[PDB]
């Protein structure tokens, strides 16, 4: 029975005892945070004197008699009992046979790994002796970590063997006085806490984007299966890393940590990467701390940050300085440091541990120092761990590595490749200390040749015939067929060819030729196609101009291109205010020109098409397509796609962006029937699908925004065209709304997603959806014939599959450059470092190879949103918004506030009423709080750039978070929050950690609730439903 006399002392917990108390209270339903040694001893061992020496050892150390009391107290306490014998069991297995002995042993050892400790009621150490044979023993010795750092076992076992020798040889204990752990508790209370929290808030000052490693799936359930992978570097690589360290004036630990940092940077596409470091938080100021038994090991955030031009040497010195600066403050609890970060709970998500001196080998050699009757013959260690990955590094003669990972979250191939990447970085650094960080490759030859073969697997032979030669050679195949149709008039291929010959004869008489760009300002009436083909047949490049564009742009294009001639309709001539000849395409002299074929008086490689893109310059830049770029497209589109000869296709787009003419050429060069969209039907969608039905139209070209929105409008839903068979789209990250998903099934319409910047060619990847399944955010697909896609880093280094990097395009669909402003071309086009001689072009877009070999889009590199520390697919938010039957049309944008802080706002068009909290709840039903927009705006229609892409300029500025009203039904329920958090009178809706709570204060909250309300609310419930609303299930 208890009596007060049995308590020796009480203390508050140290920071890391508080951390492992948190663990033990969290994981209770399957808890185990339990070191297990197995030590095998051969020789003669008196199990009596080993029992007695264990009991003396437990008397000697107060931490072996500590029990932790948290139930109803204001504060967790250590309680040190005066006497507390531990369970010691002796099993004489020596009568059993080997196959029985080793089974009974392993069954015990496995069950002992399962047998949890009660931090209060049960002694926190266990020993078992097994006598396997007349001179063979195994010790299983398991203890909660909260007691001590596992490495302390070297001291504890030296003490144990000293006690055993003193007993068996009847001699007094020479053991030096135990360094009391209350010295550390007192020193922790004497220290200036706030100066340390200020250091840690400075250390994390600019930390923007959370680090990651490629997780297999969202953690839908806490399934865990501890799995390992291990590998080691060669002798020479290890010694050369050691030389690098000895010469950059750092420890090899700093080299290992910098190499890990560089790996994390390459995997994260970021220059600032933070990971957890496990540090021996033993301050050198404490007397005798080097032999003090207790829990000191602390997890601290370790941060490696690269400048854009920094060398690895210069990052080594930076990391050295940072680690030296951190050492004064590494006793701070990580649960406090987390509050000094915008990431809060998610700051650290994996650990790198360097084991300069393990417990094994050390314990496996010290025992040779004594004349006792036994020798340590084998040794083992087990330790559960919470993190999904831990990296252990052991700088032996070969630098050995081990990954302890949850196989529920990381694939074996992911860890295998990560190990190969670590080897490659290590070798690169070892050979040349001074390599640029962006110039270290991750990839071995097996990765490299595969990624380059992903180019050549697109290889093809094509005749490279001129685009108007390919037309001519097709038009003779069906001269009687109607090629182009307008409101009522039409042209056959014969009529097109004749009229184009006439115009080409006129132009050539007018001096048009290989050097010559011909303007067209034609009203998308029939003559526009004749204009194109006649200008090309005249051997010159057509420059399409929009009647609706500003006169400022119509002037800028004409004055910047140095176009000698423009062709227009009569009524549009007045737009051409420049001093340049302006020919009516109806001119009778051209009607009188000779209709027979003109000659292909041009080379296979000349320019033929200039269009001007928007961008970051206020000046649009004229981009130009060589004949080879489009010729490469047309043959691939025939060979491997589902355009067909007999199909009927609208030229819908606004006659000035790369896709629009690519519909024309694909339609013409396959004998189909083009219909010229009346520019009023470009807006009245009510008429578009009607015209599609009436003309049985079958191929459509539609911007991505059109698919995000127009098929979602409930009024339009029933007017969807039944004759359609293919819809082709390009422009933006595609969102296939659930309505559009359904309006694909009903008619099995093939939707095609095409990636393409203008400078490469109208498309360079395709994905085609038949309607087996359609994800909401489809990929951009596979590289077209004679193209490579290279996901590079900034040093043009290939980067591993599945990882975000710059999307470079190569092959015949690469243009000559920028027409004028030519100096920008050298910034955007270059030679392919991996296929020298082929041109290369950079899109400012990040992409990722999927495991199936599809290409996956990650938006522009200029606009990485990363709000509240977390990257946020605006496509996911736009998906959840657009799926709501209340929402017609959602655009989600990162804004900058009037302080320069980025924040999310959703611009939303509402079919039927709802209000800010209603959609905020709708998002919270499916989307994390970091990716719910802080403001919402209602508009009549999202503005669209004439090409259909949404206009980030044309949206109104926000005006005027977690805040919610006061609502308390029972302040008796809230006053615990009031007293623990201290912030204010509280609202019922408010969120514990958002209000500045943290793990340990949750323990205080539970112990208060389970005193003042006498309910044992699990520590998990405060995380599932971290608000005062959650109580209802416990009181109704």
């Amino acid at each position: 029975v208890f009596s007060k006399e049995q308590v020796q002392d009480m203390y508050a917990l140290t920071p890391m005892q508080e951390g492992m108390l948190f663990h033990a209270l969290l994981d209770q339903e399957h808890n185990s945070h339990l070191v297990q040694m197995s030590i095998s001893l051969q020789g003669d061992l008196d199990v009596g004197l080993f029992t007695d020496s264990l009991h003396v050892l437990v008397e000697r150390y107060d931490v072996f008699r500590t029990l932790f009391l948290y139930e109803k107290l204001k504060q967790p306490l250590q309680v040190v009992l005066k006497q507390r014998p531990i369970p010691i069991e002796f099993y004489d297995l020596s009568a059993c046979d080997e196959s029985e002995k080793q089974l009974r042993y392993t069954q015990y050892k496995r069950a002992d790994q399962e047998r949890t400790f009660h931090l209060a009621k049960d002694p926190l150490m266990r020993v078992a002796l097994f006598q396997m044979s007349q001179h063979d023993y195994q010790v299983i010795w398991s203890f909660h970590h909260i007691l001590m750092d596992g490495w302390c076992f070297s001291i504890i076992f030296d003490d144990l063997l000293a006690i055993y020798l003193s007993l068996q040889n009847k001699t007094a204990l020479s053991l030096e006085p135990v360094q009391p752990y209350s010295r550390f508790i007192n020193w922790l209370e004497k220290q200036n806490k706030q100066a340390a929290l200020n250091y840690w808030s400075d250390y994390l000052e600019a930390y923007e984007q959370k680090t990651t490693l490629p997780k297999k799936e969202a953690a839908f359930a806490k399934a865990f299966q501890p799995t390992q992978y291990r590998f080691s570097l060669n002798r020479t690589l290890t010694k050369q890393l050691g030389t690098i360290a000895s010469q950059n004036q750092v420890t090899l630990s700093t080299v290992i940590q910098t190499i890990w940092g560089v790996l994390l940077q390459k995997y994260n596409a970021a220059h600032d990467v933070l990971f957890g470091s496990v540090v021996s938080g033993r301050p050198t100021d404490i007397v005798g701390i080097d032999k003090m038994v207790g829990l000191f090991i602390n997890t601290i955030p370790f941060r490696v940050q690269a400048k854009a031009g920094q060398t690895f040497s210069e990052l080594l010195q930076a990391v050295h300085k940072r680690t030296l600066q951190s050492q004064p403050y590494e006793h701070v609890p990580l649960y406090d440091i987390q509050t000094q970060s915008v990431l809060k709970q998610e700051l650290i998500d994996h650990l790198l541990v360097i084991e300069n001196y393990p417990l094994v080998e050390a314990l496996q050699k010290k025992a040779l120092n004594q004349q006792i009757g036994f020798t340590i013959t084998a040794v083992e260690m087990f330790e559960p761990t919470n993190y999904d990955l831990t990296v252990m590094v052991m700088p032996k003669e070969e630098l050995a590595f081990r990954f302890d990972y949850n196989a529920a979250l990381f694939d074996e191939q992911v860890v295998q490749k990560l190990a190969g990447h670590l080897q490659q970085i290590a070798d690169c650094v070892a050979n040349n200390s001074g390599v640029e960080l962006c110039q270290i490759p991750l990839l071995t030859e097996a990765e490299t040749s595969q990624l380059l073969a992903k180019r050549t697997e697109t290889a093809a032979d094509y005749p490279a015939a001129t685009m108007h030669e390919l037309f001519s050679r097709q038009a003779e195949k069906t001269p009687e067929q109607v090629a182009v149709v307008f409101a009522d008039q039409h042209l056959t291929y014969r009529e097109l060819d004749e009229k184009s010959n006439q115009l080409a004869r006129f132009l050539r008489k007018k001096g048009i030729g290989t050097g010559s760009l011909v303007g067209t300002l034609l009203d998308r009436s029939l003559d526009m196609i004749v204009g194109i083909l006649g200008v090309l047949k005249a051997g010159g490049a057509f420059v399409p101009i929009d009647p609706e564009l500003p006169a400022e742009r119509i002037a800028y294009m004409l004055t910047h291109s140095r176009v000698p001639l423009v062709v227009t309709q009569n009524h549009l001539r007045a737009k051409v205010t420049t001093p340049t000849e302006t020919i009516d395409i109806n001119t009778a002299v051209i009607g009188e020109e000779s209709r027979a074929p003109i000659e292909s008086l041009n080379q296979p490689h000349d320019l033929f098409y200039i269009i001007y893109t928007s961008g970051t310059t206020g000046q649009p830049k004229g981009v130009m397509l060589e004949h080879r770029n489009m010729a490469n497209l047309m043959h691939f589109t025939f060979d491997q796609t589902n355009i067909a000869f007999h199909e009927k296709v609208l030229q819908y787009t606004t006659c000035s962006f790369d896709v629009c003419y690519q519909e024309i050429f694909s339609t013409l060069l396959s004998g189909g029937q083009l219909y010229l969209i009346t520019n009023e039907l470009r807006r009245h969608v009510e008429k578009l699908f009607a015209f599609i039905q009436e003309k049985q139209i079958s191929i459509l070209s539609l911007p991505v925004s059109f698919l995000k929105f127009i098929f979602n409008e409930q009024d339009y839903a029933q007017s969807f065209p039944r004759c359609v068979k293919h819809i082709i789209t390009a422009g933006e990250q595609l969102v296939v709304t659930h309505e559009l998903q359904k309006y694909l099934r009903q008619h099995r319409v093939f939707l095609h997603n095409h990636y393409g910047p203008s400078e490469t060619h109208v498309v360079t990847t395709c994905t085609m959806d038949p309607g087996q399944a359609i994800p909401e955010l489809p990929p951009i697909g596979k590289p077209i014939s004679n193209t490579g896609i290279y996901i590079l880093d900034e040093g043009l280094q290939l980067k591993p599959e599945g990882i975000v990097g710059e999307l470079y395009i190569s092959g015949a669909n690469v243009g000559r450059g920028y027409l004028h402003q030519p100096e920008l071309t050298a910034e955007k086009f270059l030679d392919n470092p991996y296929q020298p001689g082929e041109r290369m072009y950079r899109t400012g877009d990040l992409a990722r190879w999927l495991p199936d070999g599809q290409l996956e889009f990650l938006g522009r590199i200029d606009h990485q949103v990363k709000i509240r520390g977390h990257r946020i697919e605006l496509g996911e938010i736009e998906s959840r918004l657009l799926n709501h039957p209340a929402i017609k049309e959602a655009v989600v944008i990162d804004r900058a506030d009037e302080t320069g802080g980025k924040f999310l706002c959703a611009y939303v068009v509402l079919q039927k009423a709802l209000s800010d909290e209603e959609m905020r709840a709708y998002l919270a039903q499916a989307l994390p709080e970091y990716m719910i927009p802080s403001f919402f705006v209602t508009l009549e229609r999202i503005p669209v750039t004439p090409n259909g892409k949404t206009d980030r300029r044309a949206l109104p500025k926000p005006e005027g978070d977690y805040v919610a009203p006061t609502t308390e039904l029972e302040q008796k329920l809230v006053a615990i929050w009031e007293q623990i958090l201290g912030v204010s009178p509280i609202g019922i809706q408010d969120h514990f950690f958002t209000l500045g709570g943290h793990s340990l204060k949750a323990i205080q909250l539970i112990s208060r609730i389970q005193k003042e309300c006498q309910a044992d609310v699990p520590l998990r419930v405060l995380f599932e439903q971290p608000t005062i609303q959650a109580l209802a299930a416990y009181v109704e």
Binding site: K4, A12, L69, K72, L73, S246, T251, N356, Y357
Partner: protein, 554 residues
Amino acid sequence: ESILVSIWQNVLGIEKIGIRDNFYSLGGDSIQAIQVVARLHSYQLKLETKDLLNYPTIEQVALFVKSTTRKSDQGIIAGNVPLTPIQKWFFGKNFTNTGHWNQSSVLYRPEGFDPKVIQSVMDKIIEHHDALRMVYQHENGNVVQHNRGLGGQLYDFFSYNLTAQPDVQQAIEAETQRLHSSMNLQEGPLVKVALFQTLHGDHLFLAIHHLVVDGISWRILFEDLATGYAQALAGQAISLPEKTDSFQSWSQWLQEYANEADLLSEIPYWESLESQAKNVSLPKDYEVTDCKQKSVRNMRIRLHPEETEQLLKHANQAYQTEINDLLLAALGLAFAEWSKLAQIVIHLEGHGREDIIEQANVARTVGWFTSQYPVLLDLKQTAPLSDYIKLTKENMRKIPRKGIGYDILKHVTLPENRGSLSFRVQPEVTFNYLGQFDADMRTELFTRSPYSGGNTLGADGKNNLSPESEVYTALNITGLIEGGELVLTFSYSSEQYREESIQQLSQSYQKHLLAIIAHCTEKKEVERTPSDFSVKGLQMEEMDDIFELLANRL
């Protein structure tokens, strides 16, 4: 230094470490540094790894290798010495004849003392401790202390033979009464010495001005004089223990500490004290504003040796108290019965030296270090004595630095720095408990003169203040043990109280002290109190709730 050139090699395992090879380049490490520091600690040198790692070259880290122990000046210090709080209190009290406020004792030796031998001792013993040479400049409308470089006028010495008068005690009394008057505080020997020859042997007089001496300092001085005299009688060269931080350096670091953030942290405690004490007032038999020491009379109460040995050896265990906690609880009960006030404030003389300045060592310093702090006693809930004793223990444990702070705030902190503290509370009653008399009988080579007269160290000294001095405390209560009996002396101002009322208060004290001794011996359980458990801010309700929760969990 070559010591560290070695200690690296015998840790890192790399030979021929140079004067500026690099700890890391040699292969140092985050841990191996701890080993190097521990190995250097065997040479009594301290080095933070925070410097070994940060200045990773021997030539550069030599700038931070320090001795583990200082060796404070064994020579001479001189010049201005800032007034300590007790000294500023003294000059603020403005006594009539401040030159008559002293401490003294009279030694004896069975075969006497050779005058030249004891004078030769007093030469060196007054050289060694510097504060005893100080003088107090009665100028510039204020006082400033000065300490004197060696010369003449260290101490004043007188010699007498009393054998001509059979009443030797009266002759030595009347002659020693002179010297107490003769402290030329402006410039003169603040140590007075006399020798009185007699048929029974030689009587040796020492007297010192209180501004430069203390009880603990009188122990120090007697053990120093005992070794000095043993050395002189043995004929060896006289030399003395190594000097600790000499009093000038103490005053200096004290004024440096007197403004630090540590002491200022106490301010809300001493505010809670003064704000709660405001209305205390011990009632008076006669209303008078001041009295003179000649009006003071003293009376004594005694405990028998059995009760004394119970009080010392056993009562402490019932509550893990110390002796002061029981004596003060008995005093509380006595005032609860006698004064019938709800509260009283009792002043206590702590010895100071309270490890305040972390670098300081004053274990051998001679000076007036006494720190005076008030304590408020609750007198209401006296009925459950089992809990009045605990309330008194924990009140004594709530004093933040054993009271050294309050005098510094009162006299030496910068006056804008010290907050709302009024310092208006005045010592109507003061309580002290001395240890054994063995602070005087600390060596056998000489003994206290049987003719001690009024010339004792403590409150039973009679000559050591001028009869014309003010009464600074109305009730002065001091404990001592002699011959195994506790004695409490009540000294009081006649013309503020009459004899019967102090007889009453002293009998109420003896009654309740006996009651507490008994209660603490009859109780067989150790009922520990929240201060025993090394948890900051623990309270009775929480401690007993924790203990209830242990019973519900074991």
